[PDB]
Design a protein around this ligand. Structure first.
Ligand SMILES: [Ca+2]
Ligand SMILES: [Ca+2]
Lengths: 138, 137
């Protein structure tokens, strides 16, 4: 659990975490590496309050309609979960999702997916922005 | 529960907040107490959760058992979690449960190494307990 003063400049504080809404243009894998380069991780969303905070930020701009987050398919797990290996707690899939494409997750804004999770097949070559998280956990 | 949502003295794991309460109460009074905390005695659905709990209680040595949220369900004629659900994960200690009509603890004694044991006095045997909340509504 971070305090506000743990957050680097240009990072937003919410609920014991610091967040970077980065507008660089990376594939999902590139975004995972980027967040690691900042001693962070792609965001993991453990509760509805955190999901709401993220939606508040994403709905506050209109240039972007998807952001990479820290979940993908893992064949040994044989499921979708967070990249730390933790299973989902809060379930944030948009209506009709997932497609089960063994892909990578974003927050998406399109039709009935109103800044909710989607799975995308291409984890390398679909370039977009991402959300990094520092949570000062163990 | 959010990761940083827990009350002072509670710990987060796996979407829940836990209280390892050291006040010694009978099992029924422990159940009541967890209810009073907007919680319930812990139910252990997964080996992951079992490991977490063991991690906390094995790191102290004042107490050798903690009450948990399982007990004999007379209609089903077996042990069930106090939300009524079946005990899908086998965390019992060897040759446990020994007897029907009991309430459950984690116990550390002889062959039972921080595993579940059945105790047949759910009222007047006073021990610490573990409360779990998922912070719902
Ligand atoms: Ca998080
Ligand atoms: Ca549980």
């Amino acid at each position: 659990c971070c305090s506000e003063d743990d957050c680097p400049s240009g990072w937003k504080f919410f609920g014991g975490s610091c967040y970077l809404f980065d507008e660089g243009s990376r594939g999902w894998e590139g975004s995972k590496a980027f967040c690691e380069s900042k001693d962070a991780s792609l965001v993991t969303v453990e509760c509805s309050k955190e999901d709401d905070f993220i939606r508040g930020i994403l709905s506050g701009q209109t240039a972007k309609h998807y952001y990479w987050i820290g979940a993908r398919w893992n064949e040994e797990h044989n499921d979708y979960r967070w990249i730390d290996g933790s299973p989902f707690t809060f379930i944030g899939w948009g209506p009709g999702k997932p497609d089960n494409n063994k892909g990578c997750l974003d927050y998406l804004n399109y039709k009935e997916v109103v800044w909710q999770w989607n799975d995308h097949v291409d984890c390398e070559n679909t370039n977009g922005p991402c959300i990094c998280e520092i949570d000062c956990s163990d | 529960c959010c990761k940083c949502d827990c009350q002072s003295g509670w710990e987060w794991f796996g979407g829940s907040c836990y209280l390892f309460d050291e006040t010694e109460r009978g099992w029924e009074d422990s159940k009541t107490f967890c209810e009073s905390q907007n919680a319930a005695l812990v139910t252990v659905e997964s080996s992951e959760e079992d490991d977490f709990i063991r991690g906390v209680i094995s790191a102290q040595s004042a107490f050798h058992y903690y009450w948990i949220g399982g007990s004999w369900d007379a209609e089903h004629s077996e042990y069930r979690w106090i939300d009524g659900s079946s005990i899908s994960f086998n965390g019992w200690g060897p040759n446990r449960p020994d007897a029907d009509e009991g309430c459950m603890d984690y116990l550390n004694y002889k062959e039972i190494v921080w595993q579940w044991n059945d105790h047949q006095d759910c009222v007047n045997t006073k021990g610490p307990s573990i409360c779990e909340t998922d912070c719902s509504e």
